[PDB]
């Protein structure tokens, strides 16, 4: 039988533990949401 | 032959040459008909329905579709193998020099020990 | 020595070296469209200079 | 170029090897430059100072494999009889994979896959007969 | 393996360190016996007892194969000469006997006249 | 996406017909662009930050690729003159033509976009379209398979199964495994093109049906190996038998339908006196099997993915041909020995 | 039990069930008619 | 295939007095439950409050599953006498969040197809208040909270409108005396610190709900139990600046497909991540799947079933 | 006649009620096995073809009868297992044996090499699912992957071998047509042509090198002991070595010379390890290496006397090793561990099974002419005509053949059993029936062993 | 009649499956009609029976 | 913590609530299977199958060759000098080299 510890080895990350690229995080369950902010939103005039 | 020379391009079945006679109740047709019944068994595994064998009677659609398409598919099989042989025999008859005949010999061969 | 290690060492020999060759393709090139397009520059030069065809 | 590869097959028919050793460096050198070109895609730090450093380690070692392979084949040909054999190139194939262990202080890897590299190098000169064909039309 | 004199009762002293050494041996001996005593003397069991020492004995040969052998050294190469080596030993024995036989069939017959089987 | 979504999907269907029924070199360029403007909206759909990155990567690597094709079209005006999709004539034109086709099918030096584009789709319906789009440039290659120099077509086939056979090993994303399964199978596609034009199109018939069955088994949402792991015990157990059967056929195994293309690829190649190349095809095919082997361990082994949340209600997906086609994908070895002739 | 909260399928549809059984009849007659036509054409030719 | 060209379409025969109302976050004592029943004078349909056996309340056939068949170790009485290490604690709340999300999907499906006003007792935008109150005391570990937030970010964003009408009731700090006066003996002797934190977290839940421009009306204990006052306040107040006013063709059709299927809505609800208070053991999962298949309820599932209905073979 | 009633076993197990299953699967299989002996045995001077090339006649294969003999026997010992689990799981792993039986009949019957190949590797698929599930101990996957990556790594070179022959020299097909085959000229290009045909059968028939495929499959038990009998069928399933060596490469025996020397050392070293081993199943697993190594020696000599001993040993080992594994299963079901030292006690607790232990052990040695005396001795007699030195090496092996059997006996013939409290009932009526159904067919072969060895006999 | 038909339904299929296999595999000889009287090895002239033996 | 892992229990039929049986559960299924059809194969395949094996239907010219050889010996002894083997299937071959 395979336990939860065995499932964590094949968990969503890199399949193969990373050598150099390990900073890349796992993607979301149903399409990732990116940046909510970092936008202008409504103009101002004098 | 891959490229058409005598046969008409883009055909529904053949239509240019019809005389060949398709197989009737063939063992090849029975296996495709078995797969039509087999597709009507594993469909109840996807959508969870009581009994694979004694379940829904929409299985008749699955058997008929495999037979109808399979009969047309095997008709092309008998046609294409006939054309392949027809061009092969015509190549020997027209050229003659390419083919060579040899019969009756008395040649020595090396015998193995132990 | 033999019946468990050395006579076995034919297929584990082509697993330990196979996984090393496997890691040089999957974990290699940490994303970036930049890096994949830098490799395409070489591929055209291989077909023109390194391989004699036109 | 395939014209460079075709020159490699004409020389071993005789006994001369002084020009054969010069031809072997161009085969290993150009093949090393292919791997050196793909290593640029790994993102090199700074410019030129480390860019040449990555190309230097790959091209020089790959040219060394071909150069020794050309030398060892002619030593094995001059000592004893027999013009061309798969056993003759197997000894030369082992010497080509031996210098990979000089690249990094570990003694193995190259020497561990010495029989693996030696057999694959022998397979190239296994196809000198009509029995083996890499690419064919009919 | 045996020495000049067989070891059975040779070289024994009471002392102080040896007296505590036998006390250490009996401490584990009685501990492992009592857990067997609690398992054997009851009708409620019915079955074969595990014993962790016996399972580890079978695990020593069936497993612990590739966790070991990581220091190869010169001992592993000597074992290879005792394994792959004897296969090359008979190569100069069977071939020499066959070359002796093959020469006899062609010239100066040695095979018996009353031979027909195989 | 209401009624017009079917119309957008219809233009991809109609787009390939333009490529299929063609005599003019600019007409197929129109046919390729009919797909370009119609796949991108289905690539986006819900609008995601990952979807925006994938659609731009899908555009830039493919629009520049088709622009290389138009050069070869214009060299066919400079040299040989005539606008016919029969022969390529010039060796100078073929070098830019085959590389443009390699950007969509050869993949050996142009795989880079595939694992990122296939992962970037938010929907399961978009996964089918990328495995269906590969039918379009295959029709072009079937028309101009002579004259093109075999030295730089067979390199696109040999190297592709090498990078395909290593590129799936360090991947846990289910979309990414199927992305490198494309490149691995595309090596078999670009190998029959020099050696006998037939069975090359049958390789598509086996592949497209096998891949369309695969993603329709993932209609019950799964994006990673661990998400497909929780399927045997928590979800439908009888469904995972069909996932097992399709994955076993994806690799080269005789009692399944997926071995039947691998028959004629070697058979026709061995007839042309080549032995050293088909040997390399068979050893690299083992590397392809390994991805499917690890993915069958989500169906065979326990692996402990029970979870607290449990489903009791019956699942109702789309499933267009997820019942008829897997039966052909599991067993067609005895069913299709003489069927090689029937396709072409 | 009598299947509470309304079942998705009642079991007799007739609009879908009737035509599916009807399509098999349309296929069976069409195949035998061409089967007799093929044998008649083969006898006429040879 | 989905039909949109046909007569059945979104926005048609809807919106005019059909908006969803919710009476949520009103302490441990069920005070909002009594007022919601009288609030269905203007609204057409009224939904019951979700508990442990809420997903299996309809599901397949009438009767609910017994104890272990529904969820392993799940009881509302067990949470009253909560124990640390090996027990309910979090896995009951994760089941409670999944049950409220499932009934919200069916209520939204009841709203989209045939325009009828559905009032829900305790919505999905109220479960985080119930979790954070228990987090203040030593019951739920920090790692289980991160498991909850991952589900929170995925499941909520897929549904376009939260709630048009929101009813928040703030009672006295002596609410434990009202809970002791109630008929249930198992619900009695609950912690006063958990009930006080539940009111404190509800204060920081109504303000972000009002920030999304959703209509909210506050009612006291003296203002409670009124049919005429509650109905007139909701009718007079007009919906403005809210996210409920979306696209009729594109947005309304996409949300309807996700709400139509029960399996599709709860597809993102199950997490691939492993947790100690989530029951990961496959050995218990194999025995539970065997017992559920042997049960006279679903067994073969989806319409046709032997020894339960059985109308036709085809 | 043979196929079709075997296929009808698949709807038999599924249509029958949950209370039955095992009664229908065992009884119906026994009457099909009776009809196999009824028709297949009839042959003239040269055995004439059965019908069209789908399933053909037997020329030198009474080994098909053995597959029909195990056809019900692969269900008898698996009764102790599988009973604890679901009713649907029971039906699945009976049908996987039926699928095994379907493909195993096809291998021996069909006189082919092209279509035989896609039945040769086809037996690996049902056994893989069988091994990877129901394994009581761990490392199922460290035996399951090794089950394929040993066999398929060696057998996939047959695609580049067999097709290469039919493209140049006529066609392989019937084998009765295969007289087009000209002797090989023996060159460096012809080396890999011979190796690719051999390496496929060098794995299934275990040697000294690349032999670790077999012990991993046996030690890590699939289901109880009845599936281990199918693992015995896989060893003899690589029977095409009888057909390839005789027809495809008759002049080539110079390249066989190093491979005999490898298998000759796979007799002393494989037997030495089979002495100090701990596992009861492993001491059958390594004795099965050496017993099948005798056959590989006989094939590569190519003498008419050696094929008589080769065909005999295929049937001899197929009913003696499978008999030994059933005895290993009978101790595994009671003690719940495969350890030899722990499971100790015969006659005192197992009174009637101990006589079956004796008869199974002594058959590994050269008893009064049952089948193994017609098997082993015939090879030893044929090796002297090859070279005089052989019996000096082969005689040492005859000493250690006792050391498999007697060491398995003595380490169980101690009537202590102090730690063991289980094994109350010695054997069920089915368990004693298993032991009789393996030895008594061999005891009937004492009268007439013509249907035990027949390549021109 | 009711006790036998309800209890046994699968029990009849296996012996009938042997008869079905017996009929199918025998009729394959009708496809191979060549060499029946030709080639002198077991050839005999017909006196009363048609085409020697099937 | 194991949570749900602990479930293993020793099970044996032996004699308790079975009297004397081989099949697990139900005395009616046991007698009709484990002693009847289990031993019906013991009576048909072993006892009735012993008549066949090799005895009766000749089996690949084992008994036929003896009668064929004896008549060929007596014929060749009276007329010819060479007994059976002298030149096997060779009469006027078209050269060698």
Curated annotation (Swiss-Prot), chain C:
Which residue ranges does UniProt annotate as crossing the membrane? 31-51
- Organism superkingdom: Eukaryota
Q: Which residues belong to the signal peptide in this entry?
A: none
* Localization per Swiss-Prot or TrEMBL: Mitochondrion inner membrane
Query: So what does this one do?
Result: Core subunit of the mitochondrial membrane respiratory chain NADH dehydrogenase (Complex I) which catalyzes electron transfer from NADH through the respiratory chain, using ubiquinone as an electron acceptor. Essential for the catalytic activity and assembly of complex I.
The text of the family note is: Belongs to the complex I subunit 5 family.
Record's subunit section? Core subunit of respiratory chain NADH dehydrogenase (Complex I) which is composed of 45 different subunits.
Any idea what this protein is called?
A: NADH-ubiquinone oxidoreductase chain 5
Give the species.
Bos taurus (Bovine)
Gene name of the encoded protein: MT-ND5
Curated annotation (Swiss-Prot), chain D:
Tell me what organism the protein belongs to: Bos taurus
Localization per record:
Mitochondrion inner membrane
Keywords annotated in UniProt: Acetylation, Electron transport, Membrane, Mitochondrion, Mitochondrion inner membrane, Respiratory chain, Transmembrane, Transmembrane helix, Transport
* Annotated GO CC locations: mitochondrial inner membrane; mitochondrion; respiratory chain complex I
* Function noted in UniProt: Accessory subunit of the mitochondrial membrane respiratory chain NADH dehydrogenase (Complex I), that is believed not to be involved in catalysis. Complex I functions in the transfer of electrons from NADH to the respiratory chain. The immediate electron acceptor for the enzyme is believed to be ubiquinone.
Q: Which Pfam families match?
A: Tim17
Similarity field = Belongs to the complex I NDUFA11 subunit family.
Q: What is the lineage of its organism?
A: Eukaryota, Metazoa, Chordata, Craniata, Vertebrata
Please give the biological process terms from Gene Ontology that the record holds.
Answer: mitochondrial electron transport, NADH to ubiquinone
The SS bond pairs are none
Can you state the subunit structure given in the record?
Complex I is composed of 45 different subunits.
> N-acetylalanine (modified residue): where?
1
Q: Any stretches that span the bilayer, and where are they?
A: 21-42, 57-79
Predominant location category: mitochondrion
The protein, known as: NADH dehydrogenase [ubiquinone] 1 alpha subcomplex subunit 11
Which InterPro entries does the annotation name? NDUFA11 (IPR039205)
Membrane-related topology note: Multi-pass membrane protein
Swiss-Prot record, chain H:
Record bears the keyword Magnesium? no
Query: Which span of the entire protein is present here?
Result: 114 to 341 of 343
The cofactors named for this UniProt entry are: FAD
The organism's taxonomy opens as:
Eukaryota, Metazoa, Chordata, Craniata, Vertebrata
Cofactor comment in the record?
Binds 1 FAD per subunit.
The record's account of how the chain is modified after translation: Phosphorylation at Ser-211 by PINK1 is required for the binding and/or reduction of the complex I substrate ubiquinone.
Q: What is its main location?
A: mitochondrion
Lineage top rank: taxon: Eukaryota
- Disulfide topology: none
Gene Ontology cellular-component terms listed: cytoplasm; mitochondrial matrix; mitochondrion; respiratory chain complex I
Q: What is this protein called?
A: NADH dehydrogenase [ubiquinone] 1 alpha subcomplex subunit 10, mitochondrial
Q: Which organism is it from?
A: Bos taurus (Bovine)
Look up the signal peptide feature and give its range: none
UniProt keyword terms in alphabetical order? Acetylation, Electron transport, FAD, Flavoprotein, Mitochondrion, Phosphoprotein, Respiratory chain, Transit peptide, Transport
Q: How does it assemble?
A: Complex I is composed of 45 different subunits. This a component of the hydrophobic protein fraction.
Q: Which gene encodes it?
A: NDUFA10
Compartments, as annotated in UniProt:
Mitochondrion matrix
Protein's GO biological process = mitochondrial electron transport, NADH to ubiquinone
Swiss-Prot record, chain J:
Q: Among its keywords, does the record have Hydrolase?
A: no
Keyword annotations of the record: Electron transport, Membrane, Mitochondrion, Mitochondrion inner membrane, Respiratory chain, Transmembrane, Transmembrane helix, Transport
| Source organism superkingdom | Eukaryota
* One GO CC term, this protein: mitochondrial inner membrane
Per its UniProt record, what InterPro entries does this chain match? NDUB1
Q: Which Pfam families match?
A: NADH_oxidored (PF08040)
Q: Is Membrane found in the keyword set?
A: yes
Q: Which residue spans adopt a coiled-coil conformation according to this UniProt entry?
A: none
Query: Which subcellular locations apply to this protein?
Result: Mitochondrion inner membrane
Q: Give membrane topology per the record.
A: Single-pass membrane protein
Q: Which residues cross the membrane?
A: 8-24
Q: What does this protein do?
A: Accessory subunit of the mitochondrial membrane respiratory chain NADH dehydrogenase (Complex I) that is believed not to be involved in catalysis. Complex I functions in the transfer of electrons from NADH to the respiratory chain. The immediate electron acceptor for the enzyme is believed to be ubiquinone.
As for family, the record states: Belongs to the complex I NDUFB1 subunit family.
According to the record's subunit comment, the protein's assembly and interactions are: Complex I is composed of 45 different subunits.
Q: Which named protein is this?
A: NADH dehydrogenase [ubiquinone] 1 beta subcomplex subunit 1
Provide the species name: Bos taurus
Specify the taxonomic lineage: Eukaryota, Metazoa, Chordata, Craniata, Vertebrata
This protein's encoding gene? NDUFB1
